[PDB]
Amino acid sequence: SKLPLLTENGGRVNRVGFTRLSREGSIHKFGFFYEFTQESLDFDSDDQLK
Amino acid sequence: SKLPLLTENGGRVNRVGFTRLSREGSIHKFGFFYEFTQESLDFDSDDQLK
Numbered sequence: 001s002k003l004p005l006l007t008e009n010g011g012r013v014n015r016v017g018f019t020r021l022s023r024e025g026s027i028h029k030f031g032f033f034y035e036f037t038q039e040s041l042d043f044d045s046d047d048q049l050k
Numbered sequence: 051s052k053l054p055l056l057t058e059n060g061g062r063v064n065r066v067g068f069t070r071l072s073r074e075g076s077i078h079k080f081g082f083f084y085e086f087t088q089e090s091l092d093f094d095s096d097d098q099l100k
Contacts, residue, residue: 008087
């Protein structure tokens, strides 16, 4: 049914148009930490806690 | 009753006049054409049709 079919009287028939889309992507920030006291690394059982 | 006839003492008698008539003529345009399709000359039995 939809086949492009021409005749001898070639004219404004079978017009086609094209489309252009787009794809996005963002950037997000993360992070975490932890706190310690000098009284937790000075007199503590382990020497290499840090 | 009109022949030129000057007496012995020719005065301001027997004058004449002249006139020039004019003509005219102009041109007109013309034209006729015919249309054909490429198939009608490219698949017809008679190769020399144009």
